[PDB]
C-alpha cells in the first residue's frame, strides 16, 4: 500500500543538434572465468533484445599465457614451477545504432560489468565526406 | 622504511635519473648524429659526462618491491619469484594459477 | 615433497577452512580466486599497482580488526569502485562494528583516491570444511 | 463554507508585479548568504535509500567515473589543436 | 499584548514598503512564527498575512503552512478552527511538488501528522501521506526524531481507525523499514487486532515485538498474556 504516488522521470531534452551514426560497435569483454562471460553475454544480449538493437555474438579464441619460475628458493635447478593466465574472450557485434542507443545501452552493461572483466569497444562511425573535399581547388 | 640499504640506493638513483632525464636527452641528441660538427660533438660528450653519476640510466636496477630481490624478478607485477609464488599459491593474484598441459 | 601453502595432517583435530585445505593446485578447479580484478587480463595495464594495493588491504583490515576476522578477504574490484568482502565473527560489539566501517572506508577512499565499501558477513564461529 | 484564501488582506505591500530585473552575481555571498544556503540543504537532507542512490550521489560528486566511460576524461591537454 | 506588537510589526511593513524594499518568503514566515505566542489573537491576523502572501505574489512553502497550523493547533477540544484549516491547506497542496525554501520546510509532515491524529481523521491522513509520497516529498519528513514521531501518529491512527486487514498492509510496509515501533504502538496493534476479533495473530506480534526490543517491556508483556486469556 506504501507505493510512491508520481514518480520524477529524468528529464532527456531533443537537442537541435544532429546524431551520432554508428554502424558498428564491437563490444570485446575479456575474462578469466568462461561461465562468467556466458551470464554477462546472456544480460547483454537481453538488453539489446529489449532495447531493439541487432546483436551477433561469437567467441574468438582464447589465449593462454605461460611461464616458468623456480621450484626451490635456492639451487635445485631442475625442479620449476609453471603458471598461467587464461583470457576468454566474448564479442558483441552491435549494428546500425544512433549516438544515443549507444550511449544508452553502453552506459548499462558497462556500469554492470562483472569484477574481472575487462571490455574494449570499438566504434565505427558513418561519417560524410568534409566540405573541403568536394571539388578540387585548384 | 625502505627494505634495506640498496633498495635505498635504487629509489635516489630512479629520482636523480627522472630530474636529468630531459637534459641527458637533449645533450644525447647532440651526439647521436652525423650532422653536427664534431668539436660541438666533442664538447657535448664531456657536458654529459660531467653530470652526476646517478642520473645515468644504466645503473638503474629493477629490484623486487617487496624484498629487494635483484634477481628473479618479474617485471609486470615487480615481485621475486619466491614473493610472486607465495602470493599466487594463496589464490591471491587475479587470474593466476598452475600450469598443466 | 611440495610445501607451498599446505596445511599439513596432523592427528584429525586441527580445523582448516575450506580455503586452507586446498593446495595450490586447487587455485582454479574446486576453489577460486580472492582477488578479482583487470590487472592480469592479457594486454591489461596496471597489475603491479594493484598487486601492492592488495596486499596492503589484507594487513590492513587484519590490524584493524584484531581477532574478529574468520577467513581471507574477498577484494572486488569493478571500475572506479573497491569492495571489501570479510567474514567476521560474532564477538565484538556492533557499535564497535560500525566505527570501524566508518573509519575504514573513508581511511581508505582517502589513501587510495577511490570510492571503497567494506561488506561485513558476521558468522557464530569459523566455518570448519574439515579436521585434518 | 468559506474558503482560507479568501478574505481580509493585509494591503501594507502592494502587489508586486515581477522580481528584481537583475540580480548581483558579481557581488560575493556573504557569510550570511551562504550560510542560510546551507540551512536550505538540510531541510531535504535524506540518508541513502539505496544502492542506486549511493552511486548517484558519488558520481554527483566526483568520485565515481561517469559512464559511459570516456578514457579520455578530465584530460583536455590546454586545449591544444592538432596542429599546434 | 497582541495589539501593541501588531502595530510595531506592522509598522516595519510600513517603514519597508516606505524604504523601497520588497519583503522575501522569510519576511512573512517570520511573522507566522512569532505570531505563535499568542495563540488565539493572532489567528485571523496570522491568515491576513497568508491572504497578503498569495496577493504579492510569494507562494506560501512548507513551512509557511507549519507555522499556521502550529498557531491554530492548541490545546482546545473542539478544534473546529484547526478541522477547517487543515482541511483547507490540504487541498491547495495537493499534487505540489516542493523546493527547499525556508529552514522549516521540514517540520511540515510531522506537524500535519499530529493534527490528522488529534481530528482521528484517517481520510486526512491518508492525503497528509500521499504528499509526502508524490515526487521528491519524501525528503522533507526530517530528522530520525521527526520521522518516529511522523510515522508514530500516523500508524497509531491506521490501526484505530481502518479495517484489520489493511492495518496489517501498512504494518509489513512500514515495519521496520520505515521505522522502529515504540512499545505503545504495539500495545496499539494489539488492541486492534481485539476489537477485529482476530487474535491468531497475537503471537506473532510477540515474536515482532522480541525482534523489536520490547522483549522486557512490563506494559506490553501484560497485555500480551491479558488479552490471550
Ligand atoms: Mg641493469
Ligand atoms: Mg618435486
Not at chain 1, 28 to 43: P, Q, R
Not at chain 3, 54 to 61: A, G, H, N, S
Request: aromatic residues 10%.
Amino acid at each position: 500500500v506504501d507505493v510512491p504516488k508520481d514518480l520524477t522521470k529524468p528529464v532527456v531534452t531533443i537537442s537541435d543538434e544532429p546524431d551520432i551514426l554508428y554502424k558498428r560497435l564491437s563490444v570485446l569483454v575479456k575474462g578469466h572465468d568462461k561461465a562468467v562471460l556466458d551470464s554477462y553475454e546472456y544480460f547483454a544480449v537481453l538488453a539489446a533484445k529489449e532495447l531493439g538493437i541487432s546483436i551477433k555474438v561469437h567467441e574468438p579464441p582464447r589465449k593462454i599465457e605461460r611461464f616458468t619460475l623456480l621450484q626451490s628458493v635456492h639451487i635445485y635447478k631442475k625442479h620449476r614451477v609453471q603458471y598461467e593466465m587464461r583470457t576468454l574472450y566474448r564479442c558483441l557485434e552491435l549494428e546500425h545504432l544512433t549516438g544515443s542507443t549507444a550511449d544508452v545501452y553502453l552506459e548499462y552493461i558497462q556500469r554492470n560489468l562483472p569484477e574481472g572483466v575487462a571490455m574494449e569497444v570499438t566504434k565505427t562511425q558513418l561519417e560524410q565526406l568534409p566540405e573541403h573535399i568536394k571539388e578540387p581547388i585548384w | 622504511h625502505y627494505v634495506d640499504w640498496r633498495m635505498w640506493r635504487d629509489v635516489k638513483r630512479r629520482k636523480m635519473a627522472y630530474e636529468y632525464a630531459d637534459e641527458r636527452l637533449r645533450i644525447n641528441s647532440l651526439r647521436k648524429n652525423t650532422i653536427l660538427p664534431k668539436i660541438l660533438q666533442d664538447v657535448a660528450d664531456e657536458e654529459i659526462a660531467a653530470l652526476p653519476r646517478d642520473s645515468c640510466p644504466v645503473r638503474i636496477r629493477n629490484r623486487c618491491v617487496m624484498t629487494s630481490r635483484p634477481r628473479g624478478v618479474k617485471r609486470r607485477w615487480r615481485l621475486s619469484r619466491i614473493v610472486f609464488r607465495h602470493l599466487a599459491d594463496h589464490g591471491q593474484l587475479s587470474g593466476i594459477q598452475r600450469a598443466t598441459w | 615433497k611440495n610445501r607451498a601453502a599446505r596445511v599439513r595432517v596432523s592427528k584429525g583435530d586441527k580445523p582448516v577452512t575450506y580455503e586452507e585445505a586446498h593446495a595450490p593446485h586447487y587455485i582454479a578447479h574446486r576453489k577460486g580466486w580472492l582477488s578479482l580484478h583487470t590487472g592480469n587480463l592479457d594486454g591489461e595495464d596496471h597489475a603491479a599497482e594493484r598487486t601492492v594495493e592488495d596486499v596492503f588491504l589484507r594487513k590492513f583490515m587484519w590490524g584493524t580488526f584484531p581477532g574478529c576476522l574468520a577467513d581471507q578477504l574477498v577484494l572486488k574490484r569493478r571500475g572506479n569502485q573497491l569492495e571489501i568482502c570479510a567474514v567476521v565473527l560474532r564477538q565484538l560489539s556492533p557499535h564497535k562494528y560500525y566505527f570501524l566501517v566508518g573509519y575504514s572506508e573513508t581511511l581508505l577512499s582517502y589513501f587510495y583516491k577511490c570510492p571503497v565499501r567494506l561488506h561485513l558477513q558476521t558468522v557464530p564461529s569459523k566455518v570448519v570444511y574439515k579436521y585434518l | 463554507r468559506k474558503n482560507i484564501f479568501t478574505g481580509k488582506r493585509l494591503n501594507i505591500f502592494d502587489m508586486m508585479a515581477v522580481t528584481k530585473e537583475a540580480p548581483e552575481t558579481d557581488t560575493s555571498p556573504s557569510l550570511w548568504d551562504v550560510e542560510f544556503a546551507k540551512q536550505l540543504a538540510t531541510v531535504n537532507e535524506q540518508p541513502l535509500q539505496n544502492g542506486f542512490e549511493e552511486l548517484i550521489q558519488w558520481t554527483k560528486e566526483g568520485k565515481l567515473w561517469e559512464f559511459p566511460i570516456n578514457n579520455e576524461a578530465g584530460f583536455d591537454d590546454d586545449g591544444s589543436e592538432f596542429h599546434e | 499584548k497582541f495589539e501593541e506588537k501588531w502595530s510595531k510589526i506592522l509598522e516595519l511593513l510600513r517603514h519597508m514598503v516606505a524604504q523601497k524594499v520588497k519583503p522575501n518568503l522569510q519576511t512573512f514566515n517570520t511573522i507566522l512564527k512569532c505570531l505563535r505566542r499568542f495563540h488565539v489573537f493572532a489567528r485571523s491576523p496570522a491568515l491576513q498575512v497568508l491572504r497578503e502572501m498569495k496577493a504579492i505574489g510569494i507562494e506560501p512553502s512548507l513551512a509557511t503552512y507549519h507555522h499556521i497550523i502550529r498557531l491554530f493547533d492548541q490545546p482546545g477540544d473542539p478544534l473546529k478552527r484547526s478541522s477547517f484549516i487543515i482541511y483547507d491547506i490540504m487541498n491547495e497542496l495537493m499534487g505540489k511538488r516542493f523546493s527547499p525554501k525556508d529552514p522549516d520546510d521540514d517540520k511540515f509532515f510531522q506537524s500535519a501528522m499530529s493534527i490528522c491524529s488529534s481530528l482521528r481523521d484517517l481520510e486526512l491522513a491518508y492525503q497528509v501521506h500521499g504528499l509526502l509520497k508524490t515526487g521528491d516529498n519524501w525528503k522533507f519528513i526530517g530528522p530520525d526524531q521527526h520521522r518516529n514521531f511522523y510515522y508514530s501518529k500516523f500508524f497509531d491512527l491506521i490501526c484505530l481507525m481502518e479495517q484489520i486487514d489493511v492495518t496489517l498492509k501498512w504494518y509489513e510496509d512500514l515495519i521496520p523499514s520505515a521505522y522502529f515501533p515504540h512499545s505503545q504502538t504495539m500495545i496499539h496493534l494489539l488492541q486492534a487486532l481485539d476489537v477485529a476479533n482476530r487474535l491468531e495473530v497475537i503471537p506473532k506480534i510477540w515474536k515482532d515485538s522480541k525482534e523489536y526490543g520490547h522483549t522486557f517491556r512490563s506494559d506490553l508483556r501484560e497485555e500480551i498474556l491479558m488479552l490471550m486469556a
